[model samples]
Target: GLVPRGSHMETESLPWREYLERIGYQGLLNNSLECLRELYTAHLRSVPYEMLDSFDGTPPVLGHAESFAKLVHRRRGGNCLESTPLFGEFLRQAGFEVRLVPAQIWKVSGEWWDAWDHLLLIVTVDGEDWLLDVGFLMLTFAEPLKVAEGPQEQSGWRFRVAEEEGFPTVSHQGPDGTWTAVYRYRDEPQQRADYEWIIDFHKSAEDSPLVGTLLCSRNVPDGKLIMIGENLLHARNGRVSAEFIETTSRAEELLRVIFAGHEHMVESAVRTWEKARADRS
Candidate 1:
């Protein structure tokens, strides 16, 4: 199991203590949702999404120090697996009880079996459980969402919790009033090894769609922005918007324009997203 210590910390150029301060944590302090919100918003504004170097055969590194170094120090963006895992660690270091949860991201096709492809975090605050995700490009929650009651509204998006055969399921509604399955979980605590299985599977599975894809996202002031290799999607104030970039111009122009970090991977993402759009269409 990856304990967020030892090899994980030593492999990176930055140390854990400095990493915490870089993110604004001075000690083992308990951050209220308000404090968390302020820090999260500040971090987002500081980091932009780009893929300039990942395509140059730079292996995408996971774990806290590597992900933080790549994103904060080197200025890059990564998928949920890379982003949220590091974030969960930050929360834990901040004296919050954080659990890594497995999520099956809903495919564009809206199917059940196709879910469970994503990873997120759960934290306990004030005796209530809340969903804490900092990885979803544009749809990040401004505060920790209470895991009880009917769907709560925040900036026009609706979130609700339900139980199916005793397992808790979280759902979010789009602007069209259609609900999408975000993921499911139980009250059981999760260890780091639990996440490693899915992470390894997504990175190596022959059927995985993430490989060779140009996916980037960042939380914005007005909405969420996403670059799905060739197309860009932005959601704000209950409205969704998107645009397509030509494959050739996508790398040089749109890569840095739309996403952040590792500029070298732009061309590859463009090619990958082009094929993904074709296959899905």
Candidate 2:
């Protein structure tokens, strides 16, 4: 007999229902795009991403229910795999049909066309499918992006969906009106195991970027802030915008200043990210 994995632990099985009710979602179907957006935003505001201690050779535990409990209830931040996968579970519990979509983060040119580093969700609303991502550091759509259209603009970033050589391409517009390819995907639906394999590589392989750098990132009110080991990148609107902080020492301080609650492991994160920067540079 195949024993269920992670299914035994669920949000509904926990106090999530009570938590939702207390948050004023009682008697609400929560199946609309607007409603899902509200829920996603509220969760982001409440949960702060903090991972200094975990990166000190303490493996990040990845699961939807566990991540929700750690992030939403316990108030922590995790990388793409942990945050987005768990978020999918939350949306499912809220009565939304959620699909785990694999996305490759743009790194070196000509890596793997089908390779993906991030996991995002697609939800159906009014018979239309939209892209919903809450795990992206700063550049996040306030609402889901419509999948049917091309050249969609939101939050000052212009997006286009087109088919090239039979593969689906998603491009983001740059300041110069040039569109940059963020990632490409196939229409083939993805399963949870597919994401798990990608995430495993992210955590274990030498080619994985997450291993070399220390990163604590989040989408803020004005922009997105990312601590890539020591160098900090902040983006507002469509621009990469600024390199706000860039010293091993200052990076540690920035982590504490922004993250606030996780001061204990700042030094370790600084060391981790500093090495990552050195390797990538």
Candidate 3:
């Protein structure tokens, strides 16, 4: 059984200062984009993107306090459920206009997709809305993507968005020289408090692409570090390093080492992902 990042830990509460330190941020909190940039990049560099609990067949809790505590003290990673809402609150408390937005992740299993599939944050700073998502594994740029038309580049990843008939799409061009879309969202602001139905639906929803999926990634000095099941993809400075895990031990190692995940949980995860992949074939 995989323990959730914030679950069953006999620990004291860590302060905001501790959270700042964990993300390698020691600057004053302000409403400026530069401040957003500082804290945002620190978050990008520090927190590994992960989805262990949901993949373990357990629903994840995404409350602000718990997620923030896990980010600070546990030094753990989480999925969109954990990252976007918490980071949105962090920005709000810092005096920035932040919105909790919902999105639909693309899935191609005999023609499939779902609405309200992912959680993300939109922060309006300096009169512009910047996409601030810290939980998208192996996809988003290392920095906040300005929410506008045209191309945006960050940490060697190229991203661009387009709005067609009141809907928006965010596409990523990776080291494979392929441009693929991740998700689409409406520009309106949404509250995290009212999304309970969606959350539970995602947890047990078989059609959900997130169910039975375990993924983690982070930023290296060059580009991005991605771990999905036993496969590893290191995209750095527009270059790609790929590897395949042959055993559960190798799976455990990557989960434990690069992702900072509980290696014990990874044993079962390996089997789960293998079955899932085999089913898709």
Candidate 4:
């Protein structure tokens, strides 16, 4: 009953086996909620949310094979458009029902109405839907949150999906005990092709934060490891500590530690930091 929605959704020949290996997920492939949670955790911890591919001065390709190579073959992470759809296809091959949804992010500096710039997955397991996103920068949950309105705890964090202003908005409680809206989206199923315009905007728009900004993050074992521009920040249990990354070698070292087994990512990570420093300065 699931019609493949986009060009990337058709994953008959994709290397999903390598994908699981990349994420270190060795488990039964079933549409059960437990399997979904395991898959979500494996992905969030393994594949980082990085922007090196978009730093090559070209519009990043959203093809399934491209995403596969980036995540599996190359051992690199990608933004929402790259990792989200690929994960969607992986879930389909793993025997789960998935839908690609388009969402508009609430800007970091505070704006209610922002551009539609993010894509996440809605996985329906056993007739109930779950939100599974592995591509958000530093604001990611350790496990999937139910689509219903309630508080779900994941790795000491409280997240909820509540109806706000006619949209199903996802928010997380801050360390200060306040709720912060991360992004909002409708339940409308979307295709990867529907995001080509915004993808281009993210790649080239000077005002866009993803453009010329080095934002690399993944959920580490202790907490969350985030490298943005010249600062490396670690978040654990609601408290965040920051450190400055002053050199390319340091950037490469930290990237190796964060990405793990991706020595090939060193050069690109260094170059991305250089470009971000130059452009943002």
Candidate 5:
């Protein structure tokens, strides 16, 4: 079971042993909700949300081989298309019924963008369905949300799942008590081939939220920090903090020194500096 609903069972690229170690997941080798909870926690706490590769317009391939190289080998993080499919594969190898679900970003007033915008994983453990997504940057859920039992409060975050006009959407409560629809998923599952084009769209499309921005986000100790372009959003203990990064030095200080990323930040910083120099030279 390499791709869940898809028919690729070659398990060589599903490096569960190395990935489990990277995420610090060591536990009961059973298909229990307890194990899922532990793995989910370890996953969110370890991986980050960064778009430096997308910003460069040469995003990594959103597939098994690239996910393995970028994640476990290069010690880096990825956006939605790269992260969720890999996680879905991991779920398959771990003896779970996994589905690669396609989701759309819901912005405002029945407005949405990019049909294949976001990708997430759904796993069935003991006949219970759970939604698992490691993308969406700083707004990702820290636990596998039970589909029918959402509107859940976990680890300082509040999330609700509801049906918005025949679409099952997830909404999160903001610091201002605002309920915003983040993304919606259809009942039909998705495949890796379905999302392959989104990588290039995000890399160069002007409408992509990641384009023209230097964004990197990760969860902190009891908090989370997100850097978008030059602005900073820091949420901790119900308080929202702000920062204005005006220089590359500050960006480096925040990304390389302040976030929970692997060598990706180092490589990203190098690439950014080189690009800036080339533009000026």
Candidate 6:
């Protein structure tokens, strides 16, 4: 019989204290659904979903220490490969059962990507599985969604977790009452080793969507804040207000506000933004 290591193996070894403090999470730690909801929203609001390194042609790093340095220490956020695993580790430290589940995204271009490009978590709280995804950019759920077959409303938005064939497809309902598929995943558990080749492919391959694309997003109370290239979109309630960041100084202001404590990275972020614009021009 093969006995596995305890669930808190990575939790006990990592810098959980610093990580929680970075997110400004001052809530109960009883592994209850209430605590999960509070922690999930706190993380999204604090750590931004940015692509500075990926857009700069750097390979994505996927380790506890690497993610910790960039995310907690540097006050930065990463894409799915970086954020989700680290979040899953934190949840484990908080005495919850977590599973790393790879997902296939359904883009708005009428395309269903076949690759397992997105990383998310399945956290079991009080014996009920909940979908806690903090990595997906602007349109992600603001709170933890239970894995059930109905439309769950959160902060005036409706999301449904319908069982589509063998996988569970998560969909969002628009104001017009149309259901839009976001992503789908099975109950399969994933390992960090499973994503090694996929990460390299996304890092350098031409077809990988993250390459050369500048995208950063953070969750605000009652809304989603997003920055794509030089444009800023603030989606609150059902309406979205847009802004064009016309200067490096303006970009610096945005870094301070959206990323909070990570203002130190504004110079590097502005350089990356300028390079992205120059490459296009």
**Clash pairs (backbone) in predicted model 3:** none
Once model 2 is optimally superposed onto the true structure by TM-score, how far is the C-alpha of residue 109 displaced, in angstroms? 5.6
Name the runs in model 2 displaced over 4 angstroms.
1-5, 8-11, 17-29, 44-58, 108-114, 137-142, 244-249, 257-281
TM-score of each: 0.76, 0.78, 0.80, 0.89, 0.84, 0.89
Q: After superposition, how far is residue 163 of candidate 5 from its true place, in Å?
A: 0.9
Cα lDDT, all candidates: 0.62, 0.62, 0.69, 0.79, 0.72, 0.79
- Candidate order (lDDT): 6, 4, 5, 3, 2, 1
Q: lDDT score, residue 242, model 5?
A: 88
Regions of candidate 3 where Cα sits further than 4 Å from its true position: 1-14, 108-112, 174-178, 207-211, 260-281
Ranking by TM-score: 6, 4, 5, 3, 2, 1
Return whichever of 1 and 4 wins on lDDT: 4
4 against 5, candidate with superior TM-score: 4
Off by over 4 Å in 1: 1-30, 44-60, 113-117, 137-142, 247-254, 260-281
Cα lDDT of model 1 by residue, 1-281, tens digit? 35455364453434556555544455444457666656566555444444334433344555566677776675555556566777777667667778877665545667554546466677777777888666664454655678898878776778787785566777778767877666666555555566556656555566555544555666666667777656678778767788876556554465555544445455655665565556655
Give per-model CA RMSD.
Answer: 4.7, 4.2, 5.5, 3.6, 4.2, 3.9
Model 4 scores a TM of 0.89
Q: What is the lDDT of residue 263 in candidate 6?
A: 74
Whole-model lDDT, model 5: 0.72
Minimum summed lDDT over a 10-residue window in model 4 is located at 1-10
Selected candidate, larger lDDT, 1 vs 2: 2
